[PDB]
Design a protein around this ligand. Sequence first.
Ligand SMILES: [Mg+2]
Ligand SMILES: [Mg+2]
Ligand SMILES: [Mg+2]
Ligand SMILES: [Mg+2]
Ligand SMILES: [Mg+2]
Ligand SMILES: [Mg+2]
Ligand SMILES: [Mg+2]
Ligand SMILES: [Mg+2]
Ligand SMILES: [Mg+2]
Ligand SMILES: [Mg+2]
Ligand SMILES: [Mg+2]
Ligand SMILES: [Mg+2]
Ligand SMILES: [Mg+2]
Ligand SMILES: [Mg+2]
Ligand SMILES: [Mg+2]
Ligand SMILES: [Mg+2]
Ligand SMILES: [Mg+2]
Ligand SMILES: [Mg+2]
Ligand SMILES: [Mg+2]
Ligand SMILES: [Mg+2]
Ligand SMILES: [Mg+2]
Ligand SMILES: [Mg+2]
Ligand SMILES: [Mg+2]
Ligand SMILES: [Mg+2]
Ligand SMILES: [Mg+2]
Ligand SMILES: [Mg+2]
Ligand SMILES: [Mg+2]
Ligand SMILES: [Mg+2]
Ligand SMILES: [Mg+2]
Ligand SMILES: [Mg+2]
Ligand SMILES: [Mg+2]
Ligand SMILES: [Mg+2]
Ligand SMILES: [Mg+2]
Ligand SMILES: [Mg+2]
Ligand SMILES: [Mg+2]
Ligand SMILES: [Mg+2]
Ligand SMILES: [Mg+2]
Ligand SMILES: [Mg+2]
Ligand SMILES: [Mg+2]
Ligand SMILES: [Mg+2]
Ligand SMILES: [Mg+2]
Ligand SMILES: [Mg+2]
Ligand SMILES: [Mg+2]
Ligand SMILES: [Mg+2]
Ligand SMILES: [Mg+2]
Ligand SMILES: [Mg+2]
Ligand SMILES: [Mg+2]
Ligand SMILES: [Mg+2]
Ligand SMILES: [Mg+2]
Ligand SMILES: [Mg+2]
Ligand SMILES: [Mg+2]
Ligand SMILES: [Mg+2]
Ligand SMILES: [Mg+2]
Ligand SMILES: [Mg+2]
Ligand SMILES: [Mg+2]
Ligand SMILES: [Mg+2]
Ligand SMILES: [Mg+2]
Ligand SMILES: [Mg+2]
Ligand SMILES: [Mg+2]
Ligand SMILES: [Mg+2]
Ligand SMILES: [Mg+2]
Ligand SMILES: [Mg+2]
Ligand SMILES: [Mg+2]
Ligand SMILES: [Mg+2]
Ligand SMILES: [Mg+2]
Ligand SMILES: [Mg+2]
Ligand SMILES: [Mg+2]
Ligand SMILES: [Mg+2]
Ligand SMILES: [Mg+2]
Ligand SMILES: [Mg+2]
Ligand SMILES: [Mg+2]
Ligand SMILES: [Mg+2]
Ligand SMILES: [Mg+2]
Ligand SMILES: [Mg+2]
Ligand SMILES: [Mg+2]
Ligand SMILES: [Mg+2]
Ligand SMILES: [Mg+2]
Ligand SMILES: [Mg+2]
Ligand SMILES: [Mg+2]
Ligand SMILES: [Mg+2]
Ligand SMILES: [Mg+2]
Ligand SMILES: [Mg+2]
Ligand SMILES: [Mg+2]
Ligand SMILES: [Mg+2]
Ligand SMILES: [Mg+2]
Ligand SMILES: [Mg+2]
Ligand SMILES: [Mg+2]
Ligand SMILES: [Mg+2]
Ligand SMILES: [Mg+2]
Ligand SMILES: [Mg+2]
Ligand SMILES: [Mg+2]
Ligand SMILES: [Mg+2]
Ligand SMILES: [Mg+2]
Ligand SMILES: [Mg+2]
Ligand SMILES: [Mg+2]
Ligand SMILES: [Mg+2]
Ligand SMILES: [Mg+2]
Ligand SMILES: [Mg+2]
Ligand SMILES: [Mg+2]
Ligand SMILES: [Mg+2]
Ligand SMILES: [Mg+2]
Ligand SMILES: [Mg+2]
Ligand SMILES: [Mg+2]
Ligand SMILES: [Mg+2]
Ligand SMILES: [Mg+2]
Ligand SMILES: [Mg+2]
Ligand SMILES: [Mg+2]
Ligand SMILES: [Mg+2]
Ligand SMILES: [Mg+2]
Ligand SMILES: [Mg+2]
Ligand SMILES: [Mg+2]
Ligand SMILES: [Mg+2]
Ligand SMILES: [Mg+2]
Ligand SMILES: [Mg+2]
Ligand SMILES: [Mg+2]
Ligand SMILES: [Mg+2]
Ligand SMILES: [Mg+2]
Ligand SMILES: [Mg+2]
Ligand SMILES: [Mg+2]
Ligand SMILES: [Mg+2]
Ligand SMILES: [Mg+2]
Ligand SMILES: [Mg+2]
Ligand SMILES: [Mg+2]
Ligand SMILES: [Mg+2]
Ligand SMILES: [Mg+2]
Ligand SMILES: [Mg+2]
Ligand SMILES: [Mg+2]
Ligand SMILES: [Mg+2]
Ligand SMILES: [Mg+2]
Ligand SMILES: [Mg+2]
Ligand SMILES: [Mg+2]
Ligand SMILES: [Mg+2]
Ligand SMILES: [Mg+2]
Ligand SMILES: [Mg+2]
Length: 63
Amino acid sequence: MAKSKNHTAHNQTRKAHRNGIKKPKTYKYPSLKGVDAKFKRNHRYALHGTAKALAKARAEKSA
RNA sequence: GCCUAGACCGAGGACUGCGGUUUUUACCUAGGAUGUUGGCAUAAUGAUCUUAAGUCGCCCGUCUUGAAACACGGACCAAGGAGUCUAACGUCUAUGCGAGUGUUUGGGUGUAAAACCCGUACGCGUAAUGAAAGUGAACGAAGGUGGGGGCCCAUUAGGGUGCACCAUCGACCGAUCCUGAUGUGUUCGGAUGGAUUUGAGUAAGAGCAUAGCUGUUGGGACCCGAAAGAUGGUGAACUAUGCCUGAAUAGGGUGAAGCCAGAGGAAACUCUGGUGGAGGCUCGUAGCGGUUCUGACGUGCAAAUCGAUCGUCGAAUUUGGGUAUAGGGGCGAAAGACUAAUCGAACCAUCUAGUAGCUGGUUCCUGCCGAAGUUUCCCUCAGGAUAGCAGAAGCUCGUAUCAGUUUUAUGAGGUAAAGCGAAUGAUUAGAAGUCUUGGGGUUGAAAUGACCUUAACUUAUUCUCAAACUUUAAAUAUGUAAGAAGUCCUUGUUGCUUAAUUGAACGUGGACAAUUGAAUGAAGAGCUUUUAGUGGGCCAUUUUUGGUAAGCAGAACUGGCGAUGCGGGAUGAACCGAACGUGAAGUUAAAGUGCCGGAAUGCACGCUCAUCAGACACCACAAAAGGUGUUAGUUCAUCUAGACAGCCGGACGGUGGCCAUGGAAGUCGGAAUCCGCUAAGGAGUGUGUAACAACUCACCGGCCGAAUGAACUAGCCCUGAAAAUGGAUGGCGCUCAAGCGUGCUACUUAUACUUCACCGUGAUUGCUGUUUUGACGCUUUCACGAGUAGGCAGGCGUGGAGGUCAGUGACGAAGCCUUUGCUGUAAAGCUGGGUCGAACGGCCUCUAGUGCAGAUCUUGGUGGUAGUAGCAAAUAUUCAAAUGAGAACUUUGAAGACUGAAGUGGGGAAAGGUUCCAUGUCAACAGCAGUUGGACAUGGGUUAGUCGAUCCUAAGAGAUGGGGAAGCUCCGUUUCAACGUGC
RNA sequence: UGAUGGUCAGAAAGUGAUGUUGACACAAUGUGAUUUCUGCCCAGUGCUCUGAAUGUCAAAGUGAAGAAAUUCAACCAAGCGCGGGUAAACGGCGGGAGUAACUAUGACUCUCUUAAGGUAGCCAAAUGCCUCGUCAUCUAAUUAGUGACGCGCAUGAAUGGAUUAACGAGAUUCCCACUGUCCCUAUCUACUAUCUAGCGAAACCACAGCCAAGGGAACGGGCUUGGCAGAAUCAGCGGGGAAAGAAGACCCUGUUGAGCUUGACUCUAGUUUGACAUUGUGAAAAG
RNA sequence: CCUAAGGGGGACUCAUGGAGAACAGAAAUCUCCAGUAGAACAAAAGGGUAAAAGUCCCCUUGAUUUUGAUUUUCAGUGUGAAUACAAACCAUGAAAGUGUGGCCUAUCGAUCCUUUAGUCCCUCGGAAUUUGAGGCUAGAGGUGCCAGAAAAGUUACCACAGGGAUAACUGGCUUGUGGCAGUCAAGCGUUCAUAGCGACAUUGCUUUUUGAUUCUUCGAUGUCGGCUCUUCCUAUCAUACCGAAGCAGAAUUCGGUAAGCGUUGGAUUGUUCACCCACUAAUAGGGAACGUGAGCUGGGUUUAGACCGUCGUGAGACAGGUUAGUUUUACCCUACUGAUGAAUGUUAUCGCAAUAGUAAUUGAACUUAGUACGAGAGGAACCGUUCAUUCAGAUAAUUGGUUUUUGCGGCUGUCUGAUCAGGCAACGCCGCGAAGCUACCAUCUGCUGGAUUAUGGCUGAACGCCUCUAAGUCAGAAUCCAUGCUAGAACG
RNA sequence: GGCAGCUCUGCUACCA
Ligand SMILES: [Mg+2]
Ligand SMILES: [Mg+2]
Ligand SMILES: [Mg+2]
Ligand SMILES: [Mg+2]
Ligand SMILES: [Mg+2]
Ligand SMILES: [Mg+2]
Ligand SMILES: [Mg+2]
Ligand SMILES: [Mg+2]
Ligand SMILES: [Mg+2]
Ligand SMILES: [Mg+2]
Ligand SMILES: [Mg+2]
Ligand SMILES: [Mg+2]
Ligand SMILES: [Mg+2]
Ligand SMILES: [Mg+2]
Ligand SMILES: [Mg+2]
Ligand SMILES: [Mg+2]
Ligand SMILES: [Mg+2]
Ligand SMILES: [Mg+2]
Ligand SMILES: [Mg+2]
Ligand SMILES: [Mg+2]
Ligand SMILES: [Mg+2]
Ligand SMILES: [Mg+2]
Ligand SMILES: [Mg+2]
Ligand SMILES: [Mg+2]
Ligand SMILES: [Mg+2]
Ligand SMILES: [Mg+2]
Ligand SMILES: [Mg+2]
Ligand SMILES: [Mg+2]
Ligand SMILES: [Mg+2]
Ligand SMILES: [Mg+2]
Ligand SMILES: [Mg+2]
Ligand SMILES: [Mg+2]
Ligand SMILES: [Mg+2]
Ligand SMILES: [Mg+2]
Ligand SMILES: [Mg+2]
Ligand SMILES: [Mg+2]
Ligand SMILES: [Mg+2]
Ligand SMILES: [Mg+2]
Ligand SMILES: [Mg+2]
Ligand SMILES: [Mg+2]
Ligand SMILES: [Mg+2]
Ligand SMILES: [Mg+2]
Ligand SMILES: [Mg+2]
Ligand SMILES: [Mg+2]
Ligand SMILES: [Mg+2]
Ligand SMILES: [Mg+2]
Ligand SMILES: [Mg+2]
Ligand SMILES: [Mg+2]
Ligand SMILES: [Mg+2]
Ligand SMILES: [Mg+2]
Ligand SMILES: [Mg+2]
Ligand SMILES: [Mg+2]
Ligand SMILES: [Mg+2]
Ligand SMILES: [Mg+2]
Ligand SMILES: [Mg+2]
Ligand SMILES: [Mg+2]
Ligand SMILES: [Mg+2]
Ligand SMILES: [Mg+2]
Ligand SMILES: [Mg+2]
Ligand SMILES: [Mg+2]
Ligand SMILES: [Mg+2]
Ligand SMILES: [Mg+2]
Ligand SMILES: [Mg+2]
Ligand SMILES: [Mg+2]
Ligand SMILES: [Mg+2]
Ligand SMILES: [Mg+2]
Ligand SMILES: [Mg+2]
Ligand SMILES: [Mg+2]
Ligand SMILES: [Mg+2]
Ligand SMILES: [Mg+2]
Ligand SMILES: [Mg+2]
Ligand SMILES: [Mg+2]
Ligand SMILES: [Mg+2]
Ligand SMILES: [Mg+2]
Ligand SMILES: [Mg+2]
Ligand SMILES: [Mg+2]
Ligand SMILES: [Mg+2]
Ligand SMILES: [Mg+2]
Ligand SMILES: [Mg+2]
Ligand SMILES: [Mg+2]
Ligand SMILES: [Mg+2]
Ligand SMILES: [Mg+2]
Ligand SMILES: [Mg+2]
Ligand SMILES: [Mg+2]
Ligand SMILES: [Mg+2]
Ligand SMILES: [Mg+2]
Ligand SMILES: [Mg+2]
Ligand SMILES: [Mg+2]
Ligand SMILES: [Mg+2]
Ligand SMILES: [Mg+2]
Ligand SMILES: [Mg+2]
Ligand SMILES: [Mg+2]
Ligand SMILES: [Mg+2]
Ligand SMILES: [Mg+2]
Ligand SMILES: [Mg+2]
Ligand SMILES: [Mg+2]
Ligand SMILES: [Mg+2]
Ligand SMILES: [Mg+2]
Ligand SMILES: [Mg+2]
Ligand SMILES: [Mg+2]
Ligand SMILES: [Mg+2]
Ligand SMILES: [Mg+2]
Ligand SMILES: [Mg+2]
Ligand SMILES: [Mg+2]
Ligand SMILES: [Mg+2]
Ligand SMILES: [Mg+2]
Ligand SMILES: [Mg+2]
Ligand SMILES: [Mg+2]
Ligand SMILES: [Mg+2]
Ligand SMILES: [Mg+2]
Ligand SMILES: [Mg+2]
Ligand SMILES: [Mg+2]
Ligand SMILES: [Mg+2]
Ligand SMILES: [Mg+2]
Ligand SMILES: [Mg+2]
Ligand SMILES: [Mg+2]
Ligand SMILES: [Mg+2]
Ligand SMILES: [Mg+2]
Ligand SMILES: [Mg+2]
Ligand SMILES: [Mg+2]
Ligand SMILES: [Mg+2]
Ligand SMILES: [Mg+2]
Ligand SMILES: [Mg+2]
Ligand SMILES: [Mg+2]
Ligand SMILES: [Mg+2]
Ligand SMILES: [Mg+2]
Ligand SMILES: [Mg+2]
Ligand SMILES: [Mg+2]
Ligand SMILES: [Mg+2]
Ligand SMILES: [Mg+2]
Ligand SMILES: [Mg+2]
Ligand SMILES: [Mg+2]
Ligand SMILES: [Mg+2]
Ligand SMILES: [Mg+2]
């Protein structure tokens, strides 16, 4: 009495290709989410020290 | 290179350009048609209306995969008729002010619901976070890195600065967890430093208010629609049942008790004849009922009747009036029956516009874009939410680095195929070995020690298989890469890592410049918000599952239909071709070219003849098996040392060898079988004798001479081949086709392609010292145009409002009718003529009860049907006169009839209410008529001490004293009463 | 059910029906004249009966702990549970093998098992599937009728069994009579229909109205291809208009109902049981 | 399901086969050799595993704590499950290491409420103390319809909104099944495959069976059967003409052209179907919306009443039996059957014939003839003759039926005073009754040519023969077309 | 899930 269509993938690639299928954008810096915490913890200290060294190097060349 | 025939078109509107010839600051064919002539202007020309001809054209709206449907609504017309308003909101936009913002609760004021003015509070915002106690946002130029429009310096490039914004690493505030300083109401405090944790935060505020569209929720909620539910009332004039008081019921039959007489008997008792008049007895009227014809009728005489037939007919009978019982109630000799045409829960009003995931409807035009039937969840499966698909608004930028594609490089796979003397599983046949750990038999007097056999295993082989087997293993499809965010050199940071000076990650500085590292393309890339419809699908090729199959059910990929017209397939949602603005010319696609029908009875090679031919994919059917029909092949074989066929000789022998016994020289029949001259043939092939015969042989002869036989293959045709109205290669018809196979030339024509005109959309060129009273404008160029549901835009029309035209109008507003026309793609606007009589319009804005073909829509009106169905029960009318305009129907007379005293007579109860009577009178009514009437009009008319009511009480109804009940009111009827308006 | 009652009514009442009543009565049911009979089962579900002792067991009350709220414990009514009765209460009333000097059957025996295992009767019956059972009768022929039979799907005793004179607009079979029911139709009468004068509706209606085939929502009036096709019409007729009448009453769906039932879920009038209050005055005895 | 079947470490090698050892054997235990796993690993199946993941031994609790990230299903939500780390604390091992349950792929659960653990922290808001209560973080108690309401029936008294999204007819696709027909040819048939049959197989047709499906119809297409009537099909029962036989005759069987023509009366049953009786030339099968209900009927089915049996506690059910149960409308269009009719200068008479329709059918008796044939038993046919069946078209002499001839007569009741003569009895009744109508209940009439089918032939090639055929040709069926019969085109 | 008697019968109770 209520037997209908069960499943069909007909027309699904047509709909996917109207506005897709879009590749994700790439960025210079990926997010570090999921990267090892021990590496991420230390990587914070390495970047902080790098900024200090560059700041001092420029501070030498200013006054 | 040259000559030559025809057709269609003429956009643009001073000049500017590119070229050419230069005889030249000139001319040209070179950035789009001019010249000339005739005719006509009472007309050649154009438009519309009507009609004919040719061709095409199914009925709209609706739900649907699919509608012209034998699906639903729609007889017709007019007027009305359906997304509204409000509270609170999301996005976006406009506006004012802006770390603020909002005057309008209120006060002041007023030309008085207006306008104008005022301010405290309060709301929202400016701070978050935690359940809370509580705590509460700068290490730094409010941080670093990579981009980033613009600006600055430059001078391709390059450098500086870089807002918004993007990615990323940090910092700060709150919560959570860890650590725990000086100290202390010794249990508090919480400094300091941390943590793959967490917040709708900070990190130089952005909000508030008003308005508009769209979307949301609650409200009647786009309009119309339940079956139901509740509250409060009204009914027992029908009917059901009880009660009270009345009334009604021919004529027969039968013949119970009791009684009288006679007869018999010892008694107990018996018999006979009368009489009598019983009975929920019986025949049968009135009455009450309602069996059958399943009669009539069945838009009726009638929302239950009519006729005949029938049940019952002295009681559980029939019936009037009074009275009681009332809706989850009554009443029921019980059928869920009856309770006013209403009953498995009456009627009335209200709650109530009840709710509906369901059906129906949903009103102007054009332009642009344009779907889904799929994912997940849901008492979900006719519904929603969610994601997707779609529109709109845009925003940041301007070739940055993207793609339903290829190439090159490099991965993954276990399907097709293949395999099985490869694993697993299935499976056919032999062969060789061992049985010593198989039986039977035969050896053995007994030795388990041989042999014959089958069956087992073993070995090397053999035939055939697998979706849930496999060593191997495609095609198609699929992942990644092809640089500047790259490569190389040097050396900075860390608490991570190393034995380390090693690495990891991120960096400073330097080098490699457009061949910056494959192709092809790119109406540009990126980003955001918000919202519609949809969430039944179906079809075709190929893959594929279930099923005998199905126009069946279920999947995969793609393309379609839905949502889509156009040319072809006669016809047809989907097939082939091709997708669509309005046109002109040319050419085609698919399909065709005998006629219907535009284009060949065209050119060509063959095949086929059907006493059911055949005739074009999807597709509208035919098979196995057959044919000395005909055609073409293949392989054998015989052939001029005369093939097959036919006319004509022979085939003598050894030997009549043998057996069957009627006889075998083959021949009722049988095993068999050697030798002499021939161009030739045997102890014999059929025919023939019971037999010897004799013929032909099996061969070779003569006669013309040249082809012949067998098996097989596949073309067309034929057999196989049977269905129901007459009938379909679409029809006619077609036979060296107008059929079948194949080739060729030309030709025909789609909304397709090419060139051109015009419309619109998108983009694009330029336009201010000539911008010049339109820059929301003008202008250059190119591309494009299908569309249901749906979105958006620009317009048309209607009622009313502010403003304006010092607008139109009684010398004619508005309305209405009309081949009077004009304008617009259109919605529509304007106008000529006629009619008409008092108001009305244009423009800029505001506002809404604003647009109809549908809703078995509402109300009103009108058709076809159609002068049709019909006006046929109750026996029946006729002549004359009178009256009158008029006589089937009135009156009177004469006649003929009927009811036939249980009447068609004479009165009454209920109910009606003037219908009664006289006079006048015919518009309507009396389903014909009408002089008549219960019609219409004017008058008149009902007389009581004795006839009724009035009085009595009946079943019952109902005050009081009282007692309940919130109360409307309920009980009770002399009741727990000091009860006389006493005589 | 003996009235301080049974059955029933009312919101309540100093309220009602039966009841102007009293077991030969009132109330509640079942079966359904007469005749002959009404067998077995009290395990189930009901109904009913006692409670000397007794599991569960509410509120109030009692005792203990606690600062109290509170908690815990004992006691603890009816009901239920326990025990008995009751079938003219609701109802129920069995299977498997062997066996007799042929065969068949099974008087008889064995075996499982119940509360009891269908008794007297009756039957292919209005109750029997198989089934049109088998035999007889009725007929030329009988799925009908009647009489028998009975391992009876699934007969059976006041959920009444078996009969039964009389009665029946009840259902059925046969026979006589009778006939147009029929062979097989014909004829006649009145009223219609018909025609006229007068009068004059309604249903229904997208547009309409000739066929055959095709395709098509798979049965066309319309479309395609054919056949064809000539005004205006009257009486009849019932092939078609998938004719009209009614938003299918069958079926399914809906998170739509309603009537009815019960051991559905959730309650409830009534009734019953306890406590407190109304509620006072004495005596005695047990705690 | 598992305190190991989790975790770590170590040692060993499994299934099975062969050869050997007292009882001991096919299977006890021991030994050696071979042994790629042919074993085992809790449980389905697949993958995985050999100094192991298997077997045995030793030690253990990492099946622990904190909170993030990720994969699958996915909306990139939840739940389940899993992965890689961070920070602890541990187990094990010499150690490197490994371990966040089970070698991997399944083995599970929100809000509200309750309860426990933790922090012993926050709150009970006029201020405190102690009980009590409420919060915060993590488990547990559960929804199996497993993203998670709290839930029994019946309706044959029924209602509403809808649905052809969906069943009960027809129709359409299909044709398994039903029915019918072929091909091959092992056998049957005294012999002998094919006169007649025909196994094992195999190819079809049909839509007269029943399924399968669910395309149409649920704002309705009237659902059984019979009666009535017309038509069509052929897969032919009879009738015409023929071919074949295991055809002597008679009968019968097989087959061809053939649907022209017929195919019945009854008992029982609602029946379709069936089954008997009987006649007959034969009693063939089907279709037309399973033809046919505004044609009927209404026995059946299938509303509501009622009974029984079985089932159910019950209301009730039964596709079981039984009895009673409203069958509506045509006047429209078309079509059919008949009937008029304008205009084809008027009117009249007589005609022609396009086209359409069509009609006859079957039997018996006599004769042939007791003949052919046959041993006999039996036993035909053609020519012919007389009748009959079914049908058709007329007709009314006769006979019968019918009577409003109300024609004549008769009869009852009543009315007109009697008589005569009449009236009435919703034609009063009866007998006869002409005329008209009418009946196989009566009588009459129902034609002869051509062309063919099957088939049998002639001449005659192909194919020097043969051959009914290929060219040509003969006869020939109830067939066809005419003749004859009916209408006459209203636009011949 | 509470009582109680003989691994258990009876009664009573029920917000995930
Ligand atoms: Mg679906
Ligand atoms: Mg021009
Ligand atoms: Mg056309
Ligand atoms: Mg619709
Ligand atoms: Mg449909
Ligand atoms: Mg339509
Ligand atoms: Mg149709
Ligand atoms: Mg319909
Ligand atoms: Mg509908
Ligand atoms: Mg209609
Ligand atoms: Mg209007
Ligand atoms: Mg604030
Ligand atoms: Mg706070
Ligand atoms: Mg900020
Ligand atoms: Mg309503
Ligand atoms: Mg309700
Ligand atoms: Mg009354
Ligand atoms: Mg009657
Ligand atoms: Mg009737
Ligand atoms: Mg009638
Ligand atoms: Mg009578
Ligand atoms: Mg009933
Ligand atoms: Mg009534
Ligand atoms: Mg409404
Ligand atoms: Mg729904
Ligand atoms: Mg488009
Ligand atoms: Mg749920
Ligand atoms: Mg629908
Ligand atoms: Mg494979
Ligand atoms: Mg696979
Ligand atoms: Mg394969
Ligand atoms: Mg291979
Ligand atoms: Mg193998
Ligand atoms: Mg939506
Ligand atoms: Mg949605
Ligand atoms: Mg569907
Ligand atoms: Mg659609
Ligand atoms: Mg198309
Ligand atoms: Mg076309
Ligand atoms: Mg075609
Ligand atoms: Mg034609
Ligand atoms: Mg032409
Ligand atoms: Mg054809
Ligand atoms: Mg054609
Ligand atoms: Mg042609
Ligand atoms: Mg468009
Ligand atoms: Mg208005
Ligand atoms: Mg003026
Ligand atoms: Mg005018
Ligand atoms: Mg005017
Ligand atoms: Mg005026
Ligand atoms: Mg104005
Ligand atoms: Mg309106
Ligand atoms: Mg209208
Ligand atoms: Mg009318
Ligand atoms: Mg008339
Ligand atoms: Mg009448
Ligand atoms: Mg009389
Ligand atoms: Mg009068
Ligand atoms: Mg009148
Ligand atoms: Mg008149
Ligand atoms: Mg009057
Ligand atoms: Mg008096
Ligand atoms: Mg008085
Ligand atoms: Mg009284
Ligand atoms: Mg009082
Ligand atoms: Mg009883
Ligand atoms: Mg009992
Ligand atoms: Mg009992
Ligand atoms: Mg208590
Ligand atoms: Mg007790
Ligand atoms: Mg018995
Ligand atoms: Mg019986
Ligand atoms: Mg019976
Ligand atoms: Mg009979
Ligand atoms: Mg019988
Ligand atoms: Mg019984
Ligand atoms: Mg008894
Ligand atoms: Mg009984
Ligand atoms: Mg009797
Ligand atoms: Mg009777
Ligand atoms: Mg009676
Ligand atoms: Mg008539
Ligand atoms: Mg068709
Ligand atoms: Mg037709
Ligand atoms: Mg039609
Ligand atoms: Mg036509
Ligand atoms: Mg009809
Ligand atoms: Mg009629
Ligand atoms: Mg409906
Ligand atoms: Mg639902
Ligand atoms: Mg309900
Ligand atoms: Mg009801
Ligand atoms: Mg272990
Ligand atoms: Mg393990
Ligand atoms: Mg180990
Ligand atoms: Mg996830
Ligand atoms: Mg899971
Ligand atoms: Mg506080
Ligand atoms: Mg307080
Ligand atoms: Mg839980
Ligand atoms: Mg739960
Ligand atoms: Mg669920
Ligand atoms: Mg679920
Ligand atoms: Mg039922
Ligand atoms: Mg359907
Ligand atoms: Mg079939
Ligand atoms: Mg078949
Ligand atoms: Mg043989
Ligand atoms: Mg169907
Ligand atoms: Mg229907
Ligand atoms: Mg019909
Ligand atoms: Mg109908
Ligand atoms: Mg035939
Ligand atoms: Mg024959
Ligand atoms: Mg015929
Ligand atoms: Mg009968
Ligand atoms: Mg049929
Ligand atoms: Mg039928
Ligand atoms: Mg009919
Ligand atoms: Mg009818
Ligand atoms: Mg009936
Ligand atoms: Mg009934
Ligand atoms: Mg019972
Ligand atoms: Mg009756
Ligand atoms: Mg003779
Ligand atoms: Mg007389
Ligand atoms: Mg008289
Ligand atoms: Mg009379
Ligand atoms: Mg006579
Ligand atoms: Mg010859
Ligand atoms: Mg011939
Ligand atoms: Mg010939
Ligand atoms: Mg004529």
